[PDB]
């Protein structure tokens, strides 16, 4: 009908527990395309798990979860499906689901979120292989409505791809819902999104840019690489009012 993906709702589970987070798909087809989960703790804020291919069911995972959260999806339904086993307080945190084109490696569209709470009480309240970390500042930009706003993403290591382009993202999440994509591949304005946002740099150092900062882009940006898995979020920055 129209794109939207349906995440089930709050979890409260006490250690030891597992979960099976739902996430039902609809606007588009299950199959083709690769649906992408996000761990989100405040105080880490996002972090990829895994990916998963509906259509060969195919999995990937985030050396850092896999082994404790297992991608199946079921498609009669539209639905994918991610469970966390030998829950810990550790898990706390809110859970993403996350489309992922292939001409941009991006993620479009978004769930509206699951938040899990481990806890015991009922009621609410060796050598390796060095990923790329993105380096974001600076990490709040307090503003007076109307002045421009420039942010830097630094990636440890060089984001072009073998093809010629260059997946560095940046993402807007406004405090309540999921992160929202504003700039793909750099520079290029995602379907919406307003134009006096505009992205730029290369190699290492990016920038987004807004001439003139409004109201209704008050938030937390993100920048992501993803011509490297892991799929690496920056820091964040958070852009208020003074």
């Known amino acids: 009908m129209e794109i939207q993906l349906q995440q089930s709702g709050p979890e409260l589970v006490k250690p030891g527990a597992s979960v099976k987070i739902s996430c039902k798909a609809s606007?588009?087809?299950?199959?083709?395309?690769?649906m992408l989960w996000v761990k989100q703790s405040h105080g880490k804020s996002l972090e990829w798990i895994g990916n998963?291919?509906?259509?060969?069911?195919?999995?990937s995972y985030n050396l850092k979860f896999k082994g404790k959260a297992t991608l199946t999806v079921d498609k009669s339904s539209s639905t994918a499906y991610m469970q966390l086993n030998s829950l810990t307080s550790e898990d706390s945190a809110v859970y993403y689901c996350?489309?992922?084109?292939?001409?941009?490696?991006?993620?479009?569209?978004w769930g509206q979120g699951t938040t899990l709470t481990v806890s015991s009480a009922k009621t609410t309240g060796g050598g390796g292989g060095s990923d790329v970390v993105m380096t974001q500042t600076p990490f709040s930009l307090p503003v007076s409505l109307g002045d421009q706003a420039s942010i830097s993403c630094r990636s440890s290591?060089?984001?072009?791809?073998?093809?010629?382009?260059?997946?560095l993202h940046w993402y807007l999440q406004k405090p309540g819902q999921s992160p929202k994509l504003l700039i793909y591949?750099?520079?290029n304005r995602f379907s919406g999104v307003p134009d006096r946002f505009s992205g730029s740099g290369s190699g290492t150092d990016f920038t987004l840019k807004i001439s003139r900062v409004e109201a209704e882009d008050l938030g937390v940006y993100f920048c992501?690489?993803?011509?490297?898995?892991?799929?690496?979020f920056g820091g964040g920055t958070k852009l208020e009012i003074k």
């Open positions: 996350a489309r992922k084109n292939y001409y941009g490696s991006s993620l479009d569209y």
């Open positions: 606007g588009y087809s299950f199959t083709d395309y690769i």
């Open positions: 998963i291919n509906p259509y060969y069911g195919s999995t």
């Open positions: 290591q060089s984001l072009v791809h073998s093809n010629g382009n260059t997946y």
């Open positions: 591949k750099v520079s």
């Open positions: 992501s690489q993803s011509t490297h898995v892991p799929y690496t």
